[PDB]
Amino acid sequence: MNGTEGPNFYVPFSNKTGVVRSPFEAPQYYLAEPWQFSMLAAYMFLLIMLGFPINFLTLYVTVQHKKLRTPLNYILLNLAVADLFMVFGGFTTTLYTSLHGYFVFGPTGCNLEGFFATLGGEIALWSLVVLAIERYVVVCKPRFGENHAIMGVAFTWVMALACAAPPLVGWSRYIPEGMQCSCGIDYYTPHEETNNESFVIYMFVVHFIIPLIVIFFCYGQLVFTKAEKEVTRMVIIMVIAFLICWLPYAGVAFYIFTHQGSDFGPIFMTIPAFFAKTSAVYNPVIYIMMNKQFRNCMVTTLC
Amino acid sequence: MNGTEGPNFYVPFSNKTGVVRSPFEAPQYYLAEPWQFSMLAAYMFLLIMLGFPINFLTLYVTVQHKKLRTPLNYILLNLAVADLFMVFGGFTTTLYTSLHGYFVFGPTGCNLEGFFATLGGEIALWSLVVLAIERYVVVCKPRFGENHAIMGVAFTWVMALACAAPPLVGWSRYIPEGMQCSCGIDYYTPHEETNNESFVIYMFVVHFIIPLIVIFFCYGQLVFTQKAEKEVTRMVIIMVIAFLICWLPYAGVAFYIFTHQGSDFGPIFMTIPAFFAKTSAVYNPVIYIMMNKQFRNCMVTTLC
Ligand SMILES: *[C@@H]1O[C@H](CO)[C@@H](O[C@@H]2O[C@H](CO)[C@@H](O)[C@H](O)[C@H]2NC(C)=O)[C@H](O)[C@H]1NC(C)=O
Ligand SMILES: *[C@@H]1O[C@H](CO)[C@@H](O[C@@H]2O[C@H](CO)[C@@H](O)[C@H](O)[C@H]2NC(C)=O)[C@H](O)[C@H]1NC(C)=O
Ligand SMILES: CCCCCCCC/C=C/CCCCCCCC(=O)OC[C@H](O)CO
Ligand SMILES: CCCCCCCC/C=C/CCCCCCCC(=O)OC[C@H](O)CO
Ligand SMILES: CCCCCCCC/C=C/CCCCCCCC(=O)OC[C@H](O)CO
Ligand SMILES: *C/C=C(C)/C=C\C=C(C)\C=C\C1=C(C)CCCC1(C)C
Ligand SMILES: *C/C=C(C)/C=C\C=C(C)\C=C\C1=C(C)CCCC1(C)C
Ligand SMILES: *C(=O)CCCCCCCCCCCCCCC
Ligand SMILES: *[C@@H]1O[C@H](CO)[C@@H](O)[C@H](O)[C@H]1NC(C)=O
Ligand SMILES: *[C@@H]1O[C@H](CO)[C@@H](O)[C@H](O)[C@H]1NC(C)=O
Ligand SMILES: CCCCCCCCCCCC(=O)O
């Protein structure tokens, strides 16, 4: 083992020189210089200051205009709400933690940070499953209305909770990653008390592989068989954007899980874990660029 | 209006073609196919056949093991009893109604179905209030013993009855919903003779918002402020999440209807949330078995 395991942490830094301290107890300046922590904090402050207004405006515009009741409108409303939970529930702790160089709030802070990021990301992935099914139904006509869209929304919360909630209550756990200023699922230790290995397999199979199978089956039907075209084009970009956002994180996580205790440093997981937090802001940006009706309503409300 | 109001019903289907019939008089096949009603009957049959044994077993194990006398144990015992009232008092009517496609038993059957589902759901909500307060006292130490647990049990019945009973006796009313095979509070019509509007505000304020405020206050105190206690605290968190999954869709659709009476919605709109919510009779003992090691071990001992 090239790192330092504690009761509730795994620091990717050897304690041969005795300098490692718990990320719930002291600033982690032995593994990165203070200016690097400041860069994480500046980045998180930007995400909060952009993420709050752009997601609140999306929610507000949608509620104000009764014309905006297609399945796409409902799903983007759901994403805006989930993004606001990410921003206020999790990113406020990421910011405070990055400012101080460690989880001042202790494991409770780590739980907040990990839970709301996992919940928000999985709401997005299962939302794409709903949109992929909706596009397949509408285009391939094997009708998907408001009732199905709302049932789709409720479905995304249930699936996301089934992924994000168990590590709060004893199946796996949230644990600091990288420079120790964000938390994720424990890919790092066997920790039999929380049955870590089975949760990670469950997460990658049920909450990553199975959704992508559905999405690409639906896409394969679309391909290998103006208003609707605009929606289909937007969903294509939402799926591409999702993979850009989360595949680096998913790949590094899976590497760690299959290479536990190997020689990797703090920057290895820091970059993908923080890049993935752009998930709280990018979907409304795509929405504005690629949906004429929503863009016009937004300009109408804002002006 | 986009539906059809009768003296004691509101069908979410237009009578512009003359086909609408009272859900107390004839099968409702004009608004859904017979196979759709049969799916409701199959679902209700499963809930009864799972609901009776899992709740009876929870009751039996608790009574047969004097070690199971913590506040959590009393509250889960109370939920088991309330679940059994839901299963035999209400769901047997839901099943018979779904088999035939209308309330063969008339308004009396509608009252039974609505009353026992409302009572059961409200016993669970107010039970979560009791548990949230117990966790607050225990973890934040600002002592909660057997006396307080039993007092909490009696309190949940009083509050739940204060929600479920008035529509039996003239304040609001129970009325069929969706495909007309379950009944709920009258969100649909003004019906001033039963003062419908004031009851709905009372129900959403006293019997939804206020409990939730107490629960999240107690939780917030816990967050911004041993192993045995952690296990109980973890289970209560999951009980609250499960309650919200079960009931928020129904509450949201009900509140939408109340604020948009006569708007254009169909029978499927309330059918799915109202029938999904009936899982409330089953899921709490399932959490209990999965998240309390002492109870699960007692159950194995009893069963084997
Ligand atoms: C890294 O190694 C150091 C040195 O062995 C650990 O610090 C010691 O911890 C023991 C047990 O608490 C104390 O009795 C010693 O006084 C500590 N020594 C010093 C110099 O502080 C330290 O705990 C290790 N870090 C981690 C995270 O395990
Ligand atoms: C829906 O409309 C039909 C047609 O108007 C109603 O049926 C009539 O009801 C009146 C009053 O009971 C009778 O006198 C007529 O003989 C009925 N006509 C037919 C063709 O059946 C029906 O009552 C309406 N449904 C509801 C629920 O109001
Ligand atoms: C569809 C558009 C997709 C756009 C996005 C494409 C992302 C490509 C990269 C994925 C990360 C894979 C991570 C694999 C990790 C292997 C690392 C490794 O072997 O490193 C050993 C070393 O010890 C470590 O410090
Ligand atoms: C785990 C619990 C899951 C949920 C269990 C809920 C209760 C059972 C549902 C029965 C279906 C009855 C109605 C089936 C209707 C199918 C057709 C339909 O939805 O049509 C919509 C229409 O096209 C307008 O948009
Ligand atoms: C904590 C975990 C929570 C998990 C569960 C989340 C549930 C989300 C669903 C909400 C339903 C709200 C109903 C809103 C009604 C909108 C109605 C509408 O605009 O459409 C009317 C039309 O008539 C239709 O056919
Ligand atoms: C900054 C904090 C983060 C990234 C914390 C947790 C994130 C996860 C556990 C992400 C899981 C995944 C998601 C949301 C979607 C793609 C696959 C996944 C299972 C790696
Ligand atoms: C299947 C039959 C049902 C769902 C009948 C009635 C249910 C209610 C009137 C439920 C009311 C509420 C409960 C129990 C808890 C959440 C809030 C609420 C007031 C909508
Ligand atoms: C309504 O009357 C007109 C409102 C026009 C608002 C346009 C303001 C855009 C200003 C630039 C914002 C950039 C933020 C992102 C930086 C990375
Ligand atoms: C630690 O790193 C060394 C060097 O790469 C490697 O040989 C060793 O297997 C690693 N330890 C573990 C447990 O993987
Ligand atoms: C019936 O539906 C139409 C179409 O949505 C709407 O214009 C009308 O206001 C509705 N009626 C009522 C009473 O809401
Ligand atoms: C402008 C786009 C930049 C793309 C950055 C991708 C970030 C994740 C890269 C993973 C590196 C690592 O394994 O540490």
From Swiss-Prot, chain A:
The modification N-acetylmethionine is found at M1. A lipid is attached at C303 (S-palmitoyl cysteine). One of its GO terms (cellular component) is photoreceptor disc membrane. Keywords: Acetylation, Cell projection, Chromophore, Disulfide bond, G-protein coupled receptor, Glycoprotein, Lipoprotein, Membrane, Metal-binding, Palmitate, Phosphoprotein, Photoreceptor protein, Receptor, Retinal protein, Sensory transduction, Transducer, Transmembrane, Transmembrane helix, Vision, Zinc. It is found in: Membrane; Cell projection, Cilium, Photoreceptor outer segment. GO terms for biological process: absorption of visible light; cellular response to light stimulus; detection of temperature stimulus involved in thermoception; G protein-coupled opsin signaling pathway; G protein-coupled receptor signaling pathway; gene expression; microtubule cytoskeleton organization; photoreceptor cell maintenance. Phosphorylated on some or all of the serine and threonine residues present in the C-terminal region. Contains one covalently linked retinal chromophore. Upon light absorption, the covalently bound 11-cis-retinal is converted to all-trans-retinal. After hydrolysis of the Schiff base and release of the covalently bound all-trans-retinal, active rhodopsin is regenerated by binding of a fresh molecule of 11-cis-retinal. The modification N6-(retinylidene)lysine is found at K277. The chain crosses the membrane at residues 37-61, 74-96, 111-133, 149-169, 199-220, 234-255, 268-289. SMART domains: 7TM_GPCR_Srsx. Residues 1-36, 97-110, 170-198, 256-267 are extracellular. Glycans are attached at N2, N15. It is a multi-pass membrane protein. Changing N2C: Stabilized by a disulfide bond and normal light absorption. Expressed in rod-shaped photoreceptor cells in the retina that mediate vision in dim light (at protein level). Disulfide bonds join C110-C183. GO terms for molecular function: 11-cis retinal binding; arrestin family protein binding; G protein-coupled photoreceptor activity; G-protein alpha-subunit binding; guanyl-nucleotide exchange factor activity; identical protein binding; opsin binding; zinc ion binding. A motif ('Ionic lock' involved in activated form stabilization) lies at residues 134-136. InterPro entries: GPCR_opsins, GPCR_Rhodpsn, GPCR_Rhodpsn_7TM, Opsin, Retinal_BS, Rhodopsin, Rhodopsin_N. The record marks E113 as: Plays an important role in the conformation switch to the active conformation. Residues 62-73, 134-148 are cytoplasmic. Belongs to the G-protein coupled receptor 1 family. Opsin subfamily. Photoreceptor required for image-forming vision at low light intensity. Required for photoreceptor cell viability after birth. Light-induced isomerization of 11-cis to all-trans retinal triggers a conformational change that activates signaling via G-proteins. Subsequent receptor phosphorylation mediates displacement of the bound G-protein alpha subunit by the arrestin SAG and terminates signaling. This is Rhodopsin. The lineage of its organism: Eukaryota, Metazoa, Chordata, Craniata, Vertebrata.
